[PDB]
Ligand binder design. Structure first.
Ligand code: B12
Ligand code: NA
Ligand code: NA
Ligand code: NA
Ligand code: NA
Ligand code: NA
Ligand code: NA
Ligand code: NA
Lengths: 453, 252, 453, 453
């Protein structure tokens, strides 16, 4: 391979594949902080061309962290279909981009081809895509999973109901659930980040969620987003199991930062299969987001996009029901503004779909970043046209306890009625019987939690 | 081993299974526009995107690029400037680049001929390259034409950080019957050489409107050649003095 | 009428309606430049609330430039259906916003209500809309016109083929036409900005466009975007008349700057009716964009959003086939970056639709602005979801003579296939008979201008 | 041109285009009275052949009344698209007939071609059409307009509710409105010919009509068919404006007979636009009928068909929501029997559609003509298959005050259910919600005015 190109008569040389992959990124505050970003637009473009010219082999054989050094690298590499890899290993990344985007490449074509990819190769493709490339490419790569709802079917759009409370007060939690359900939110999951990471508390929250599910016979699933170890404890001890959640990171060191062993995810699958109230075969929920590895000093000189792609590669091993990036969850140090957050969301979603996972996005931002609610509205609509599997919902997007702004319950109804998309078909049935939705639209009496009393 | 800025990169035809590839070569030759690059599904081919992005990097650079005062001093041109002090402020304050700074006025009254029939004024405006690349070729034959068959030729000068409307104040201070302005127009993706001329008969700040000007845009080797443009400007000038009118007040 | 409120215990008072309209705007470059922007975030919110509390009557009765002093104000006021106005004059702008957005407000409801607005009221409404408000509100207000194609039908999406040349070289113009047609662009118009505004040259450019239309029997229309007087001349003297074009401004002073008298637009309509090769009843084409008035010293202390909306009140009087903003055509001084250009595009489009015109957008930026091609792709997709009637198309979006970047031909095909939208129905039929489109998608043979040879 | 043919060896010469146009008519009592009719069938046919051989130019340049002599001639001629005229001016009338009737001539084709016609040319075509030609030709020329209802869409059939009372008694008027609405009549208009032509009375009638409209929120419009001057007075003075009505005539002298100035129609458009409760852009209502010009001594030697065509040409200038001929309204002196009345109705409707106006028919007759109710039933069904825009309705067809018989409320339901046609889509929605109509058919409880109490 070449690590060198000339552009307008000036030679642009790079040290290694890693450097090329980093500098090819669109500018973000994260890559600058990590000190891996291009020096100018010229060198950004030169890196893109060098990358576009490397083969699948070139990139597959040069992972950011070495096989024998990193359990996540080993997981990713060990999961390759070597027959699919052998068909494409001599393709340039340029050629792989064009393949993904081609109207003559079908869903079934991509289904086999994607098995010959590693996360690094997935990343390389994302790096040479425009914003429209990322949206259109992602849209022609649907990924459908099933718990008690079916998510990911083209023409549909799901949503997590996020009824968080600063005190985990079951009244406040319930209040927001009735509100979200009235806007048709919750077909992805009813998921709470709890305050105490504690068996008694987890079951109490879970009991709260499932009290509403069981009372109205809602086709959905509940989740409490504490450490995977504590959710497993609670479910083993009798609490209702829906989805089992873990945050992940794309290196072994990253996982250690989070207190996560791979064997915990094995165990979560096993517990799911013994205990969980799930009809379909998918029951895991992962969450990701650009900058985690960097925060943990676990990026090993790699840009945050390449690292984020490694998360999806890890996730794919466990066939989760849903994954989402929490796109602007941390702050300006990794993603500074509107511009950069939109790009990252489009990148994250496209890479997730290319990796063949059930990829959603928490379109969100924080109050110390250069961002506002109009950003979340721009981004949610773009991602929806990309076939984004699901977004979040809270009352007006205000999390009273995680201290950021995500999408409103309003925003899911907006997206759905704007783009003629429907909920998960099972959930849509339930909304119709409750008189909340007719022909994909909120009825006159929707958006009113007192409807449930 | 392709340089994206190369002539080869520019002439690249990317249509996959073309109906008539000989026609595509003919078409690509017809135009400086980025035709015949084909597609991947509905999206641009990777090479076409790459060259676009390469050109864009070069384009941004031409926005902030400034002429040395060493270069204008060597042109034997007086240098004056608008109220603007720098490139960053120019981009954000149109109102300031439309006014002379308080020492500009005093330099022009002390160094330029009063009440000329035709005044040439030159500015970098939005693209330095437009005047640097074009200058030796347009400027001399222009002011040759004006004296050679003509009359009172004013003394030419450079306004830094100028915007077109600054030529109304200039015409008032010097009492020019006609004012002609060569100014860089905003740079395009693949080109920053494009020069325009904005000319007015007997302008006044408080009365003259944009439609009172005649425009001749896209001056450069790839549009209307500088030598040739200089002759059309000389012609325009003398028609303005005959007609006591410019732009939208000039016959046919 | 209250010109004051209290936010967090601080009293916020404004001079007049005009100040309220200005300081309610989301932050943009041009407002700061005009000296009319908010001093702080709180004051912007306070201006928004004060404005939301004003009545339709409050705003209608305080135009930005007086009736007696401005022919554009007169035109807008004299066009009001006073019966519709009387129904709504006591509504607050908040109640009008909520009415526009309501799913119980139909297209026919809005049909009558909008006749009671003036542009200042249109603008007021826009100022208190979030980005998703502007998109969803616009989408539920379709505006449909008909030349030789029908434009604006929900579920369709049209494009201007902009085959501009540095020398007006008929070979270069023809080349770009054939290319655009191959991507399904040109259903809105095939429209050239010429280099020279003379009759012989205009006739030659028209002869070039119509040579192609006539040879392949394309259902569409041509246009040469010179001064309206010159077009009229050419057409009277025998050139093929399609659409008649004029750039406009929202004040009488601004029109003077442009060299345009209202009588010219009357005449253009008369000339269209006698000469033009148009089957339907619409034949005018206007272009607008934020900053034009301010540049012309013609905003009289009003902001660029309020002034832009007045462009639409003017245009509506002449029932044009199409109108578009050229959203980022000018420079960073009026709209600085991605964020500001997107917002402006959503505003302009929402305001045009609310004014009842056939509103499209040239999603574009300049090289001296903090913007890139990814911006055009973000905005074009958002505007498509909003039901934007049309965008532009140039090869890769690079205009060799207007020195800016607009959308590529690829972008229209992308948008159509991404959102399952169709061209104008008459043009779609033509594309299918050419073997260029099948079921709304580009065939394998598409995208190759050599196909016409 | 030739004004001469030989037929069975006998030379048939004619004086002028006018003579040819008159004698080409199918026999009616009107042309005999006017003294312009053929002397035999042979000379009728010879005139038809001579006419069929003249060009569009021949007829366009020879109007029944000269340009400089007649304001209606000037209106008609001044409205020609000279580019469309130049394409067809050398066609024979034979060739224009065949063009109109061709299955390869589309609605869009006719849309442009019709702009190159004058009323005289429209007439000439009608004169060489059989009854089936007139029906099929008219059917392939839809003309769609919109007030608060949409009229003219193929597959639909509208109706004027005509609740006239000898004393303008608001109870009698209201009684018939509830009756008509119960049969699904009124989607065209609720239109009353009043007894007193008087502001107080007009507003009282209008108040009556709109009381029913406003109470049941009916998507329709009301009208009072007094002189246009008095309707304008009343509407200016505060009465509800729906459609503004005027009877018209095809010559200047004819208009004088009716007390109509062209400037009154200009003013009615302007008043409509300031005052009227109309969502769409059409608000005028014209009425015509063979024989008016003759009655007024204003035919200037022209047959009544050619004169009637000039009415449509006048009407087209003002883009009315609806026009109808009042086919048998006057008496046997102009149209004697069944035969002649059917022919005239088919002629009037075809010419109206060819002129591009929203053409309906009052299928009616008088008690001194050789006619009965079975005539109205024959004619209404034929015209309905022709795509006639609307007919009238009164209780059983008996006007208690204009002293003639039009169509029953029954007849609209009959036509609709016979031919599978629907009401204006907006009105159909309203009928469905009232339980009057299901799937285009009257429900069990329809035809009962007490349903409204
Ligand atoms: C930007 C721009 C505008 C802006 C205004 C200027 C600005 N940018 O702030 C807006 C969007 C208002 C605009 C409007 C119109 N413009 Co203009 N404009 C341009 C453009 C793209 C840039 C010029 C530039 O950068 N100048 C250099 C900078 C440094 O000067 P500035 O002080 O910042 O800007 C001044 C000039 O741009 C001037 N100007 C801009 N356009 C025109 C057109 C004419 C005829 C005149 C006399 C002056 C003029 O107005 C500004 C004063 O505030 C050129 C295309 C090009 N290749 O240059 C077309 C261009 C100059 N405009 C054109 C035209 C025709 C128009 C319009 C008449 C409508 C139309 N048909 O498009 C209107 C009204 C023009 C007028 N009489 O004021 C033509 C002029 C042809 C000619 N020789 O007569 C051009 C050349 C493009 C084209 N090929 O059609 N335009
Ligand atoms: Na359990
Ligand atoms: Na960090
Ligand atoms: Na330039
Ligand atoms: Na030029
Ligand atoms: Na005044
Ligand atoms: Na009224
Ligand atoms: Na008579």
């Amino acid at each position: 391979m070449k690590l060198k190109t000339t552009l307008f008569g000036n030679v642009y040389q790079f040290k290694d594949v890693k450097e090329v992959l980093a500098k090819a990124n669109e500018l973000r505050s994260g890559d600058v902080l990590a000190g891996v970003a291009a020096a100018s637009s010229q060198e950004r473009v030169a890196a893109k061309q060098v990358l576009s010219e490397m083969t699948v082999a070139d990139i597959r054989n040069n992972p950011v962290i070495a096989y024998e050094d990193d359990c996540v690298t080993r997981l990713i590499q060990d999961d390759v279909n070597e027959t699919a890899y052998n068909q494409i290993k001599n393709w340039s990344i340029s050629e792989l981009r064009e393949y993904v985007l081609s109207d003559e490449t079908s869903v079934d074509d991509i289904a086999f081809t994607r098995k010959g990819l590693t996360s690094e190769v997935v990343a390389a493709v994302a790096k040479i895509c425009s914003n429209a490339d990322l949206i259109y490419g992602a849209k022609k790569m649907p990924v459908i999973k099933k718990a008690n709802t079916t998510i990911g079917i083209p023409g549909t759009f799901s949503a997590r109901l996020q009824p968080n409370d600063t005190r985990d007060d079951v009244q406040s939690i319930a209040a927001q659930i009735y509100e979200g359900l009235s806007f048709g939110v919750g077909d992805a999951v009813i998921g709470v980040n709890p305050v105490t990471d504690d068996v008694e508390n987890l079951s109490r929250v879970l009991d709260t969620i499932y009290g509403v599910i069981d009372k109205f016979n809602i086709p959905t699933q509940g989740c409490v987003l504490a450490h995977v170890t504590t959710q497993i404890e609670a479910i083993r001890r009798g609490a209702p199991g829906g989805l089992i959640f873990q945050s992940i990171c794309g290196s072994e060191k990253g996982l250690k930062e989070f207190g996560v062993e791979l064997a915990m995810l094995d165990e979560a699958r096993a517990v799911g299969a013994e205990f969980n109230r799930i009809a379909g075969e998918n029951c895991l929920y992962f969450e990701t987001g650009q900058g985690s590895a960097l925060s943990a000093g676990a990026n090993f000189g790699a840009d945050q996009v390449t690292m984020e792609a490694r998360n999806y590669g890890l996730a794919r091993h466990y066939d989760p029901f849903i994954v989402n990036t929490v796109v602007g969850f941390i702050g300006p140090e990794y993603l500074y503004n509107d511009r950069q957050i939109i790009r990252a969301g489009l990148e994250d979603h496209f890479m997730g779909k290319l990796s063949g996972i059930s990829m959603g996005c928490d379109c969100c931002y924080t109050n110390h970043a250069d961002a506002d609610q109009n950003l979340n509205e721009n981004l949610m609509i773009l991602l929806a046209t990309a076939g984004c599997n699901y977004i979040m919902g809270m009352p007006l997007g205000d999390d009273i306890m995680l201290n950021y702004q995500t999408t409103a319950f309003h925003d899911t109804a907006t997206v759905r009625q704007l783009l003629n998309l429907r909920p998960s078909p099972e959930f849509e049935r339930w909304l119709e019987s409750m008189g909340i939705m007719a022909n994909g639209r909120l009825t006159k009496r929707a958006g009113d939690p007192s409807l449930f009393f | 081993a392709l340089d994206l800025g190369s002539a080869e990169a520019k002439a690249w035809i990317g249509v996959e299974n073309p109906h008539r590839a000989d026609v595509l070569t003919e078409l690509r030759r017809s135009t400086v526009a980025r035709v015949c690059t084909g597609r991947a599904g509905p999206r641009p081919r990777t090479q076409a995107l790459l060259r676009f992005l390469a050109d864009h990097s070069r384009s941004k650079d031409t926005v902030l690029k400034e002429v040395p005062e060493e270069w204008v001093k060597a042109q034997g041109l007086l240098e004056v400037r608008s109220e603007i002090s720098d490139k960053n402020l120019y981009l954000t304050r149109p109102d300031m680049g439309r006014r002379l700074c308080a020492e500009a006025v005093e330099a022009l009254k002390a160094q330029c001929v009063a009440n000329p029939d035709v005044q040439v004024v030159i500015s970098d405006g939005l693209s330095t390259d437009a005047i640097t690349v074009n200058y030796e070729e347009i400027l001399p034959p222009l002011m040759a034409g004006l004296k050679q068959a003509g009359l009172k030729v004013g003394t030419p000068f450079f306004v830094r950080y100028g915007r077109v409307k600054i030529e109304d104040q200039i015409g008032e201070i010097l009492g020019a019957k006609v004012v002609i302005l060569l100014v860089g127009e905003r740079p395009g993706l693949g080109q920053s050489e494009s020069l325009s001329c904005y000319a007015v008969y007997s302008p006044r700040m408080a009365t003259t409107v944009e439609a009172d000007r005649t425009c001749i845009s896209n001056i450069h080797q790839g549009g209307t050649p500088p030598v040739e443009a200089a002759a059309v400007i000389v012609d325009l000038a003398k028609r303005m003095l005959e007609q006591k009118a410019s732009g939208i007040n000039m016959t046919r």
